[PDB]
Amino acid sequence: LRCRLPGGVITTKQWQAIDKFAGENTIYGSIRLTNRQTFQFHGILKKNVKPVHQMLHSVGLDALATNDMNRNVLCTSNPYESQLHAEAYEWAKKISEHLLPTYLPRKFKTTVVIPPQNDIDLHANDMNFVAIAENGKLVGFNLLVGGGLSIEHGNKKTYARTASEFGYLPLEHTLAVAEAVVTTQRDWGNRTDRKNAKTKYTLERVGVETFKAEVERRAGIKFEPIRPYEFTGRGDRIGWVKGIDDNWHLTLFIENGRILDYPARPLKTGLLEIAKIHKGDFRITANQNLIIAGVPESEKAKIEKIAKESGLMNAVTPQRENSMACVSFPTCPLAMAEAERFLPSFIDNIDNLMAKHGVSDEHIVMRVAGCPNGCGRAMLAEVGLVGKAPGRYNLHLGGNRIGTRIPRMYKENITEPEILASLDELIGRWAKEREAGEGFGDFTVRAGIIRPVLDPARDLWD
């Protein structure tokens, strides 16, 4: 089961309660951070179905209704301009409440984004509010609509799509624009085929300008031109970063977001002990990591000692920090190939390739989905693996670091040794032929290794 938790923000009181439930009332005993900034339990003792909704209520949390088609609303967790988080989080939470129960055809995903960071992967979402600020205060949002990554193997009527720019709106019209987008999707969405009901398909059927025009009419606003924004990356800021005031944020890399006491690495007990002394709250990131947020400088050495000792600060390569996998087996009923349990050893092999070609300090945004529903967001990666059968994946290449391009399929239905043999060849070509600061995804496009995806509804499929 899964929780509503806008922006990933969770208090220490809430953390201790979900930690107790996980340890005592689930089969796996783990807390799993998701890439939509919330958490999951796995294998709830069906003896404890009622107790989980009361445990959650006991600390001020609610679970979504699965008939309810909205999902968790994301918000940039660790903005470089640290003062912007409070206003942005406030709006993510406002949008979240405003869309709580208008029955939708398909599920609906929303984000609040703070440039230059695209950690929340806006182009995977139906509705995106890109924050624009003046003098350290929010003034409004650029609206991008119509992203979604789910596809069906072999079905060229399905496709991943990035999101389309509509225009800028002042802060005052946010809730109105949000509802206008939702109801327009609700009314114009396909009533015959579930598989065609997503906003990306509606937008392609009626045209972007037709959809934008209806949203303007319903919201009683006109869109201003887009105000300038640029993204520089999608990773988390692992380690200490200086927040506002004398506060500090410690971002901890958690492999697969899986929080459990392991031999010599008591990740779950360490976070408990941190929770009990930490003066602030936690932030779950869209990269399945955890921020100890708002640590006063005086408290840094105490927090870091616990995290150090528990294994929560074991150093990993930049590659491993920028790699992700969905849950997949053993718990997902839709899974086709391993993802979570495949990734650690697969990145071991990638680490070796990266060292052998002398690029062990750089990274390739690399992701694995266990099936083409796309939960791992493989369809926005530089290198994406999409599960097809046990041990077999479609290999996609040619996304970019900032997640604004769909990678085209490169090789179909191949095994891990075959994937590694191909990546070895390509990483070597990249190591020697790349220009200054050129990403691997961009390189495969430039070197003619793969043709880019320019208009996915039309040219994703060869």
The minimum distance between CB 150 and ligand SF4, in angstroms, equals: 9
Token pair recorded at residue 461: 């499929």
Whole-angstrom Cα Rg for the chain: 21
Size of the site for ligand SRM (CB under 6 A): 27
364 binds ligand SF4 (CB under 6 A): no
E-strand ranges in 16-125 read 31-33, 39-40, 74-75, 110-113
**Binding span for K ion by CB under 5 A among 196-204, 284-292, 385-393, 437-445:** 284-292
Set 75, 212, 268, 326: catalytic member? 326
Range 324-353, binding ligand SRM (CB under 6 A): 326-327, 331-334
Cβ–Cβ under 8 Å, residues 457 and 147: no
- At residue 190, the 3 state secondary structure works out as coil
> Which option in ligand SRM, K ion, ligand SF4, none does residue 274 bind, with CB closer than 5 to 8 A by kind?
none
Among 373, 394, 400, 444, binds ligand SF4 (CB under 6 A): 373
Comparing CB distances to ligand SRM, the nearer of 106 and 283 is 106
Cα(first)–Cα(last) distance of the chain, in Å? 38
> Which option in K ion, ligand SF4, ligand SRM, none does residue 289 bind, with CB closer than 5 to 8 A by kind?
K ion
Please confirm, yes or no, whether 326 is among the known catalytic residues. Answer: yes
371 binds ligand SF4 (CB under 6 A): yes
The minimum distance between CB 330 and K ion, in angstroms, equals: 19
369 binds ligand SF4 (CB under 6 A): yes
Token pair recorded at residue 36: 């939509």
Of 61, 41, 37, 58, nearest in space to 49 by CA:
41
- At residue 256, the 3 state secondary structure works out as helix
DSSP, res 186: H
75 is in an annotated binding site: no
CA 140 to CA 228: how far, in whole Å?
12
377 binds ligand SRM (CB under 6 A): yes
Comparing CB distances to ligand SF4, the nearer of 95 and 326 is 326
b/e 409-434 (16+ beta carbons within 10 angstroms → b): bbeeebebeebeeebbebbebbbeeb
CA 132 to CA 113: how far, in whole Å?
9
Residue reference for tokens 């059927």: 205
* Total number of residues shown for the chain: 462
Please confirm, yes or no, whether 367 is among the known catalytic residues. Answer: no
Please confirm, yes or no, whether 401 is among the known catalytic residues. Answer: no
> What character string, x for contact with ligand SRM (CB under 6 A) and - otherwise, covers 14-53?
--------------------xxx-x-x-------------
Set 32, 371, 377, 405: catalytic member? 371
Q: Which residues pair with 131 in a beta bridge?
A: 141
Phi, psi at residue 301, to the nearest 5°? -65, -30
Of 123, 104, 165, nearest in space to 456 by CA:
123
Q: At what angle do helices 199-206 and 208-219 cross, to 10 degrees?
A: 110
> What character string, x for contact with ligand SRM (CB under 6 A) and - otherwise, covers 268-307?
--------------------x-------------------
Please confirm, yes or no, whether 371 is among the known catalytic residues. Answer: yes
Cβ–Cβ under 8 Å, residues 388 and 369: no
Residues at the contact surface with ligand SF4, assessed by CB under 6 A:
326-328, 332, 334-335, 339, 369-371, 373-376
Q: Which residues are annotated as a binding site for [4Fe-4S] cluster?
A: 326, 332, 371, 375
Q: Which residues are annotated as a binding site?
A: 326, 332, 371, 375
Residues at the contact surface with ligand SRM, assessed by CB under 6 A:
2, 34-36, 38, 40, 71-72, 106, 109, 121, 124, 148-150, 198, 288, 326-327, 331-334, 373-375, 377
What residues are labeled active site? 2, 71, 107, 109, 326, 332, 371, 375
